[PDB]
Design a protein around this ligand. Structure first.
Ligand SMILES: OC[C@H]1O[C@H](O[C@H]2[C@H](O)[C@@H](O)[C@@H](O)O[C@@H]2CO)[C@H](O)[C@@H](O)[C@@H]1O
Ligand SMILES: [Mg+2]
Length: 511
């Protein structure tokens, strides 16, 4: 393929200890004579699937575990198979974070959680609540200081506040259909954030570099950040502490907890070299120390070394916050969830959208895959078998139910009129089984200006193909067909779909 044999290319994010990781690479190189190269590309979490989708990219990819389910779903990750003895060296719950559809898809490295980081010289007793921060900022401003600065350009940092009074991503009691991005709890949290901005206690333009600089220069009493940030604070000589996030409406802030993880490119011809590196060089006391001494990892997955790091009050703080939060899902639409909420926070903070409308859009964006799949899967199946699914629609049931009713009505005419066209198209494609389904969805996408009619024709071809698959005793292929059409639709037409308020707009358009 495109990835070079006999060497290792490793990608890790720019806020992590990539110089320390390179030291581990240098030791691997010394032992074996095999080159290891560490890179930290911009927009890593977007660059990796771009290049890997064509069989290119790094042998080894590092990111929090939340992104890896999507990567695995898209066929970009190799299944990893550590022996029992190696598995038992790491905490079982860290392997859980990197299991997808029953398979391990990455090596867990470390548990990351956000904490409140405060300047002990300015603020010897950090606030226990978010609510007292406006008053604290007024006191500090009289001294030429501010109370709090953190990255507002990434939803990770604001999420703890959103989740505090009841906001959630996908319900965990998982029911993926149940999404809590625009409930009252999420709205209260984001509204508090926006009020801080409108009362000049924070600035909507604040990003990672700006907040880090302000804290490390001693201009702001507090920031919110993970363990990787501590190294630069050490260098700056600020007298800092790491503690529990403030409560909001008497409830703990609930950070989304990430497990830094290393995956192996499905297209790498160096999977055994990667395995050797990750298991016998990185995931050891010495390997993890080399990275940790560069930028702190947090609470590492390796039991032996975590027993040492656990005595650190900053790690104790980290795990305190982690226990109040929640391990991230790794479902394939986590990416779409984060994009949706990123846009909602930035738009609300800038005043481009009200909090209510911003979160409504993030709700629709986060629900889009599962809602679309429910409708499309049911349509394809009932079209293939001739009989409807009588199972309850579930959450947002009126929308799914009314969209399916609309799709049946409009779809009947589209299929009748396009029958000749569809027959010709199918014949040219030679679709025999599930391996043909992947390529099919892509071609279906292309075959300009977005409108619902074009989307009905797309789905109707899907139904036509579903009937064919049923007829040739490949009824098992219908659900991956449905999943593939859905993925194509919601990814390529995301912004338009959200602008229509999703399937509610479809129902309204054809009323
Ligand atoms: O902001 C959305 C973003 O959040 C998380 O990314 C974290 C990452 O986990 C940390 O290791 C650190 O690098 O900060 C990032 C946020 O800037 C999710 O892991 C990521 O997928 C998501 O897009
Ligand atoms: Mg809207």
């Amino acid at each position: 393929g495109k990835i070079e044999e006999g060497k290792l290319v490793i990608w890790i994010n720019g806020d992590k200890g990539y110089n320390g990781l390179a030291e581990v690479g240098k030791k691997f190189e010394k032992d074996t004579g095999i080159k290891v190269t560490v890179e930290h590309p911009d927009k890593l979490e977007e660059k990796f699937p771009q290049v890997a989708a064509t069989g290119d990219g790094p042998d080894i990819i590092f990111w929090a575990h939340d992104r890896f389910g999507g990567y695995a779903q898209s066929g970009l990750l190799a299944e990893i198979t550590p022996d029992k003895a190696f598995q038992d060296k790491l905490y079982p719950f860290t392997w859980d974070a990197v299991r997808y559809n029953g398979k391990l898809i990455a090596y867990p490295i470390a548990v990351e959680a956000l904490s409140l980081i405060y300047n002990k010289d300015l603020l010897p007793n950090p606030p226990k609540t978010w609510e007292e921060i406006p008053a604290l900022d007024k006191e500090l401003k009289a001294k030429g200081k501010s109370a709090l600065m953190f990255n507002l350009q990434e939803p990770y940092f604001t999420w703890p506040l959103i989740a505090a009074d009841g906001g959630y991503a996908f319900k965990y009691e998982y029911d993926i259909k149940d999404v809590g991005v625009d409930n009252a709890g999420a709205k209260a949290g984001l509204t508090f954030l926006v009020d801080l901005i409108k009362n000049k206690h924070m600035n909507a333009d604040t990003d990672y570099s700006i907040a880090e600089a302000a804290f490390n220069k001693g201009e702001t009493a507090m920031t919110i950040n993970g363990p990787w940030a501590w190294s630069n604070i050490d260098t700056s000589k600020v007298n800092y502490g790491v503690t529990v996030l403030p409560t909001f409406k008497g409830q703990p802030s609930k950070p989304f907890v990430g497990v830094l993880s290393a995956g192996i490119n499905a297209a790498s011809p160096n999977k055994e070299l990667a395995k050797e590196f990750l298991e016998n060089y990185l995931l050891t006391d010495e390997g993890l120390e080399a990275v940790n001494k560069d930028k702190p990892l947090g609470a590492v997955a390796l039991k032996s070394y975590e027993e040492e790091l656990a005595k650190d009050p900053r790690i104790a703080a980290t795990m305190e916050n982690a226990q109040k939060g929640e391990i991230m899902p790794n479902i394939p639409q986590m990416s779409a969830f984060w994009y949706a909420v990123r846009t909602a926070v930035i738009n609300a903070a800038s005043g481009r959208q009200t909090v209510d409308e911003a979160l409504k859009d993030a709700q629709t964006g986060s629900e889009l895959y599962r809602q679309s799949l429910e409708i499309i899967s049911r349509y394809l199946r009932e079209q293939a078998t001739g009989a409807a699914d009588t199972a309850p629609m579930g959450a947002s049931g009126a929308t799914s139910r009314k969209a399916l009713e609309t799709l049946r009505r409009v779809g009947d005419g589209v299929q009748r009129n396009h029958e000749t066209a569809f027959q010709g198209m199918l014949r040219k494609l030679d679709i025999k089984n599930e391996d043909d389904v992947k390529s099919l969805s892509r071609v279906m996408i292309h075959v300009g200006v977005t409108n619902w009619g074009r989307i009905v024709t797309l789905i109707s071809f899907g139904a036509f193909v579903a009937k064919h698959l049923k007829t040739i005793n490949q009824e098992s292929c219908i659900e991956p067909l449905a999943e593939s059409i859905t993925d194509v639709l919601v990814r390529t037409k995301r912004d338009w779909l959200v602008k229509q308020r999703g399937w509610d707009g479809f129902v309204e358009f054809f009323h």
